[PDB]
Each structure stands twice: as structure tokens, then as C-alpha cells.
Enzyme design. Structure first.
Site, mmCIF file in Angstrom:
data_model
loop_
_atom_site.group_PDB
_atom_site.id
_atom_site.type_symbol
_atom_site.label_atom_id
_atom_site.label_comp_id
_atom_site.label_asym_id
_atom_site.label_seq_id
_atom_site.Cartn_x
_atom_site.Cartn_y
_atom_site.Cartn_z
ATOM 1 N N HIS A 85 38.760 74.952 21.971
ATOM 2 C CA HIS A 85 38.001 73.757 21.609
ATOM 3 C C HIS A 85 37.793 73.774 20.105
ATOM 4 C CE1 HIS A 85 36.800 72.486 25.746
ATOM 5 N NE2 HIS A 85 37.173 73.727 25.973
ATOM 6 N N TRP A 142 28.638 78.498 22.591
ATOM 7 C CA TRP A 142 28.931 78.987 23.938
ATOM 8 C C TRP A 142 29.661 80.323 23.980
ATOM 9 C CZ3 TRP A 142 29.393 73.930 22.270
ATOM 10 C CH2 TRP A 142 28.399 73.068 22.772
ATOM 11 N N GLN A 161 34.214 65.530 28.655
ATOM 12 C CA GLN A 161 33.211 66.565 28.891
ATOM 13 C C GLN A 161 32.040 66.201 29.793
ATOM 14 O OE1 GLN A 161 31.922 69.547 29.439
ATOM 15 N NE2 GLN A 161 32.125 70.372 27.355
ATOM 16 N N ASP A 189 39.613 79.879 24.572
ATOM 17 C CA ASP A 189 38.606 78.873 24.927
ATOM 18 C C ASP A 189 37.668 78.515 23.773
ATOM 19 O OD1 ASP A 189 36.435 78.444 27.886
ATOM 20 O OD2 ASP A 189 36.974 77.090 26.253
ATOM 21 N N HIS A 248 44.402 77.079 25.457
ATOM 22 C CA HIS A 248 43.102 76.460 25.707
ATOM 23 C C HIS A 248 42.034 76.837 24.692
ATOM 24 C CE1 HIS A 248 40.131 74.968 28.967
ATOM 25 N NE2 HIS A 248 39.408 75.257 27.901
ATOM 26 N N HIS A 298 39.724 70.738 33.460
ATOM 27 C CA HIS A 298 38.742 71.833 33.451
ATOM 28 C C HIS A 298 38.419 71.796 34.945
ATOM 29 C CE1 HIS A 298 38.441 71.982 29.129
ATOM 30 N NE2 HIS A 298 37.487 72.898 29.220
HETATM 31 FE FE LIG Z 1 37.432 74.607 27.818
HETATM 32 MG MG LIG Z 2 34.014 75.407 28.148
#
Ligand SMILES: [Fe+3]
Ligand SMILES: [Mg+2]
Ligand SMILES: [Fe+3]
Ligand SMILES: [Mg+2]
Lengths: 423, 423
Positions: free
Chosen positions: A60, A316, A153, A310, A58, A211
Site C-alpha cells: 500500500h 498498521w 477499502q 503489504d 501486495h 482483499h
Molecule cells: Fe492490503
Molecule cells: Mg491491510
């Protein structure tokens, strides 16, 4: 070309082993009764640990490497992260996504990761990041098998043309169907979005990775729908529930009832320790909950769970070097899997369990499988984890694709002394 | 044959009463101004209490008497109970079910119980226990009116052919339609299962008794659907919500709103004190909740609630002698119904309220009703409960079907003295 890996230790096995290679595959695995001499065409594991490649279940890659561009997230909050990302809009182009994704992918190759599942935001009519990632997938194929999750998202039903865009992403080649039920406007949209997600996965024969319940809300129970639909369709192996951080806040009675279904369904679970400890518990004052899903209980119940990084160097999650042993280290601490055996078996959370999550068909040190394996300069999983060792060698198709010459530390006492952090 | 019951005390009434019998029925009830002499054809209650028969509104005769076979549940947990039951699979036959059911039924007859509602697991394609219980129902009819609930233990929508099997059980003669919404895979399956349950009850004109919200989950609110559907169909009297232990954990505001519906719906509630105190609160550490439904509040609101034993000598509840005064004793303590009047009126929870729950049409000491009554060697409900008295005589159809010669206790002080535990 390499013909053998010698003096290898294997998790759960005693002694040393020899791994014979032929035509890019593992031809046989034989035990050794002692240390074998090195020679031409032999890669010496030097009594280090040999395991199938690390896996990133996982991440991004569409947002990676953007932290501080144009400004840094000073509060470290999710809210500010959104604002900081929005300020970089002008830089989000095809080439930009490819450049950043490749930068992190190179770190992953260096870290012995040969399998990566990246989510890609498809709540964008232009599908810019997706088109870029589909090219990256082809380009990085010799080193990493990249899976792309079409991640809506902003929601499927809560975003304009959300469902149409999700399906368009699948028609363009996305490997996995994503969803985010807890972010939909209502609980009803959340449940409905999952029916739509499963329908698309069956229509296109794709995997699913939701998610799921990534929120400190004891009432966020979309995971039961994910598991129930998987069980109904008999497709548990192809389904994954990412995060499920809400489970950290469920009462025990409901969790016990739920676990029966989770086991029967056969779905996979991904916990993302580095990000979860950072983003969860933000609405608590003190005491503050950890916010990671019930990893320990899943392991005790035989439910497949694994760890993902992640985010890497983005608005983030500002940190990371895409290192799975680091992710594992955080998870073992926060989940209190600190017994010797629990730590030693920790490697499963970033290897075999993650391979199952990605539904990999060619993974593991076994005769017949592709010669994809990595060598850690450590005695076992515990040692590798404690010392946060690098990947000495990464082998793919029987060829070395990455290597790390370990750091050399010396202390100058009455005489110089080499320090390896082993007792 | 018996023509009269004399010197009887009646709950809520002052003085002594004479109950005249004729043709197996109560012909008249007259007050006495003093003690009447005994005589041929007269059963002397000896100023003891006379009440309609005790009722068992909730028991599982298909699992009764199996504790310790082949092994005992050492932890005392639900989880181990399932494992221990599974180990007895080879012994589960037609004759085995009949033998065990009859053993407990005999204890019930001895304990003045003339009405019993047993749930029977119908999440079994062979419907073995059901076929056996249907024969037992016919065999025990002269002593006990047995109602059989088709109980889909593994769920209606969450078990293969669950709905078809539930309906098959009704076609074979089950008196009541059961369900277990909180055990279904999802909240949606839970709600849907109730619509299916009500549809079947209306199709076959049967009663309903749902294992409802038996879980320490403040979000388990299937009881509102049970009550709403009953109100919609105007069939409250025929509907029962068993357990509702989740109600013990609801916030007060929701409970207050819910109670309006519960009262308007007219449905019945069964609490099972011995089992509830044992199985609920198991996920708490300390403090630990009691886990019994809101019995006291139901009584204060005029909502019909009663007590069942639930399990007798089985893997999930290892104790019991199928004694309703014992069940009542536990319920009064855990529900804190400990005021004198609350204790004295306690008998209603194991007599009249339970008769209403079973929708009985011939119950109570009243002219015209069948001569079914029992005699307790006690002054009133409080006394009967405090001393846990046995049933001196059980009369059915005007005939004695059970009798207990009380124990005789003597202490040898300076002189022998009889002890009856009365002051
Ligand atoms: Fe994620
Ligand atoms: Mg996230
Ligand atoms: Fe029950
Ligand atoms: Mg039960």
C-alpha cells in the site's frame, strides 16, 4: 553497454552460466565448464545467484512512510492504527502521496524489486491518492513496472457511491479491480460485491485482486466465490485472492473440498507474512493462532501462492525496509516451510510465483526476454535467505540500476579475521 | 406352488403365525396356538423370524466390484480411491458395468434383498453406466425391484452440461433425481442446484435422493433446503437426504431448530454406517469424530431413517458382501443404539424404514400384498443381529428365489458337540 553476465548460478541448475545480452534483451544462455575471466562489458556474478527481479505483489504505497505522524501507534493494534491515520488527515495531499510512495519505491529499487502491485484506497470521492499514484506510475516506469489496484477499502456496497468510485478509478487507468467482501455489512453484500468486481474486470479488461477473507472468521468463505467466478469466466490467470487468512481457521473437510476448486480455477494467492502474523490472532487469548493462509498446502497442491510485504513503515505495520528476503524469512518460519529444500525453493515465493500473480508477460532468465535480472552474493536460495544478503546488482534493460557494496565485518582476535557468516 | 408359511415369528408379535398364500399374494395371516406340522406346499419357518425383504436404500452398482483393478488402494483414503478408479478407465464399458452390477445383485438376492436403490454417476456425457444399468434393471426385475438414481457426482452447476445431463438421465428413465450440493463450487450453487433438482422431480414426477452434506463441515446445511423445498411442494414422502454426516458436527441448538422442520417435512434419511465410519473423521487427528448422522435422535423424534451399504468391494469401500445385517451391526455400535430394545428393533432400519425411503407401495407381511418375504433362522431381531444369521429362505411372488443351508459347527471334546452360538 553490458554484453554479458558471467559466472552465474541459477536456481535448480548445476554449475555456472553465462547470460548474453543484446539490445536490452537476453540473447542466449550458455553453460560454463569453469570460471570465466572478467572483462570490459561483462558483469561478474562471481558465482553468486542470478534470478529475475524480486516482485512486490501486495503493498500500500498510499499509506507507506506515515508511522509516527503525527503520533505513534503505541498499542500496535488495528484500531489505534485507524485513529493515528485519521490524525494525519491534514497532511494527505497529492504531493504528500507522491513523496512517500517514491521513498518506498526507492527502497524497493535498492532491493532489486522491479515489479510492484500497489493497492490504492478508492473509497474517497476526491480520489486524491489515486491521481497521485497514477503520476508516480509514469515517473517510476524506467525502474519499476507499477500496477495500481483500485481498492475500495470501505466496501463497494457498504460505502456511499462505492461502485461508482471503483469504476471511476478504472476509467482513470487503474490496472486491477479490488474488493473487500468480508468488510461489507453483510455476507450478501460480500457475494454481490464480487459479482460487480468481476463484471467491471470484464468490462474494462483488467486484472482482479481481492482483499479476501482477511479475518479470523471460520465462516468467511468469499474465496470460493472468487474462484468460482474466475472459473466461470475462464480468467483464473488474471485473478488474485489476497490474504485469505480465514483459511487458517477452516475445518479440514471444507478446505479439502475447496482446494479442488482453487486448483481448477487457476487463481493466484498472496500471503503477507509480516502483517498477517502481526494483525491476525488478535482476538485469541492463549493459545494464539498464526493466521497465515495455507501456503504449504497450496504449494503441495500446485496452487500458485506468493508473498507480499503489504505495509511499510505505516500505522498498521510500523516496520520494514521493503525487503522481500525478510518477508520470505518470516513466511518460511510461520508456515513451517523449514526443510532444506523448502527453504531453498523459497525464492519462488518472491520471484516467479509473484510474477504469475501479476500476470507478467516478460519475466524470467530466458532468451528473448528483457534483460531484467538481479545478482545475489549467495550460493543458492537457502544461503541467500539464511544470510539475508543484499542485492549486489540490479539490471534492467541491460543496464545497472542499483548496486550494493556488501558490509565488511572484522573480528580482532590474535590476528584480524574477516567474517562472512559462511562455514 | 407354496400355499403357506408356518411356524413364523413376527417382530413385535408374540407366539407363532401362519401366512397363507394365494396367486402370488398373502391372502391371510393367522395366529397359531402351537407348532404346526409341516406338509406339502408348506414352507416351515421352524419358529424362525419372518419379515418383509431386506432393502438396500443406497448403493453404487456402477462402481461395485472394482477394488484392486488394476491396483489396490493402499492408503484407504478417498483421494487414492479416485486415482485408483481413474486407472481403470479403459475397462469401463457397457458390458463391464452390467457384469459387475449383476455380481453384486446376485449377492443381494442371496442375502434376501428384494429392493435396491442404486445411484449411477451421470456426470458423463456418454452416460455409459446409466445405459447399462437401465438394462440391468429390466434383467433383474424377477428377483429385485431396482431403482436408479441419476447422480450428478461432479455437481449440477459445477460440471459442464451438468443440468442437461441430469435431465437427459431422467428422460432415459432414471427413477430418482440426485444432487450433491456440498460438492458444488459454492454454497450458492449448492442451494440453486437443489431448486433445479426439485423442479426436475416435479416436471417428471420422480423421487429425489440427495447426497447431502457428506462432509465434516459444521457449516454444510443443505439438508434444511432439501426439507424446506419438500415441505413447500408437499412431497416429503418422495424425498430422501442421504448421508447428512455434517449433522454429526452441528451445534445442538441449530440441530434442535432443524429437527422441527425435518419432522414437519416428512423426508427420509439414509445413513451408511460402514462407509461413514471409514470416510468421515479423516481430517481429525485425535480425538476423531464418528461422523454418522443423528440416527438415534431421529428415531426418538419419529423421523424416518434407515441404513445403506453404499459401496461394495470398490476403491472407496474395499469390503462388504452386500449384507444388511452387517451394515446394521456397524450402525448400532457407532450410533450407540446398544440397549436390548434398540438392538432388537434394529431390523426396522434395514426393512420397513428403508421401504418407506424408497416409497414402496407393496411391502410388508399383510393381506393383499405380494408374497415377498424372507425367513431368518433366529428368534427375534436381537438374535438375528447378534449371530449374523444368513437368510434361510427368500420368497418372492410366493416362490423361493434363494436359500441358505446354515453352516454346521462341531467341537470335539470328550464327545462331539454341535455349536449354534445360542445359550
Ligand atoms: Fe492490503
Ligand atoms: Mg491491510
Ligand atoms: Fe453414495
Ligand atoms: Mg460415496
Amino acid at each position: 553497454a553490458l554484453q554479458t553476465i558471467i559466472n552465474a548460478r541459477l536456481p535448480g541448475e548445476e554449475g555456472l552460466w553465462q547470460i548474453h545480452l543484446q539490445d536490452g534483451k537476453i540473447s542466449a544462455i550458455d553453460a560454463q565448464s569453469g570460471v570465466m575471466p572478467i572483462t570490459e562489458n561483462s558483469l561478474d556474478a562471481e558465482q553468486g545467484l542470478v534470478i529475475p527481479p524480486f516482485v512486490e505483489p501486495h503493498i500500500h504505497l498510499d499509506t507507506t512512510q506515515t508511522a509516527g505522524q503525527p503520533n505513534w501507534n503505541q498499542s500496535g493494534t488495528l484500531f489505534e492504527g485507524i485513529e493515528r491515520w485519521a490524525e494525519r488527515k491534514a497532511l494527505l495531499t497529492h504531493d504528500d502521496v507522491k513523496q512517500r510512495a517514491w521513498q518506498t519505491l526507492k527502497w524497493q529499487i535498492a532491493n532489486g524489486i522491479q515489479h510492484v502491485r500497489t493497492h490504492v484506497d478508492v473509497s474517497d470521492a476526491t480520489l486524491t491518492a489515486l491521481k497521485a499514484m497514477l503520476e508516480v506510475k509514469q515517473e517510476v516506469a524506467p525502474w519499476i513496472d507499477l500496477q495500481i489496484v483500485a481498492f475500495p477499502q470501505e466496501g463497494i456496497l457498504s460505502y456511499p457511491n462505492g461502485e461508482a468510485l471503483l469504476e471511476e478509478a478504472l476509467r482513470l487507468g487503474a490496472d486491477v479491480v479490488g474488493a473487500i467482501p468480508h468488510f461489507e455489512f453483510t455476507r450478501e453484500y460480500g457475494v454481490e460485491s464480487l459479482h460487480k468486481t468481476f463484471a467491471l474486470a470484464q468490462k474494462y479488461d483488467r486484472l482482479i485482486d481481492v482483499h479476501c477473507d482477511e479475518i479470523d472468521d471460520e465462516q468467511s468463505r468469499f474465496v470460493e466465490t472468487v474462484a468460482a467466478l474466475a472459473h466461470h469466466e475462464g480468467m483464473g490467470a488474471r485473478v488474485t485472492a489476497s490474504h485469505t487468512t480465514a483459511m487458517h481457521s477452516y475445518n479440514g473437510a471444507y478446505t479439502s473440498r475447496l482446494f479442488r476448486l482453487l486448483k481448477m480455477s487457476g487463481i493466484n494467492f498472496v500471503a503477507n507474512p509480516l502483517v498477517n502474523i502481526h494483525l491476525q490472532g488478535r482476538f485469541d487469548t492463549y493459545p494464539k493462532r498464526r493466521g497465515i493462509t495455507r501456503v504449504k498446502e497450496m504449494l503441495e497442491s500446485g496452487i500458485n501462492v506468493c508473498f507480499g510485504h503489504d505495509g511499510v513503515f505505516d500505522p498498521w505495520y510500523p516496520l520494514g525496509t521493503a525487503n522481500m528476503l525478510q518477508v520470505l524469512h518470516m513466511g518460511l518460519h510461520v508456515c513451517q516451510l523449514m526443510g532444506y529444500g523448502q527453504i531453498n525453493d523459497g525464492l519462488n515465493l518472491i520471484t516467479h510465483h509473484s510474477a504469475r500473480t501479476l500476470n507478467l508477460q516478460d519475466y524470467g532468465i530466458a532468451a528473448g526476454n528483457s534483460a531484467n535480472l538481479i545478482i545475489l552474493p549467495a550460493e543458492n536460495g537457502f544461503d541467500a535467505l539464511r544470510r539475508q544478503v543484499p542485492v549486489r546488482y540490479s539490471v534492467r534493460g541491460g543496464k545497472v540500476i542499483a548496486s550494493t557494496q556488501p558490509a565488511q565485518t572484522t573480528v580482532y582476535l590474535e590476528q584480524p579475521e574477516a567474517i562472512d557468516y559462511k562455514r
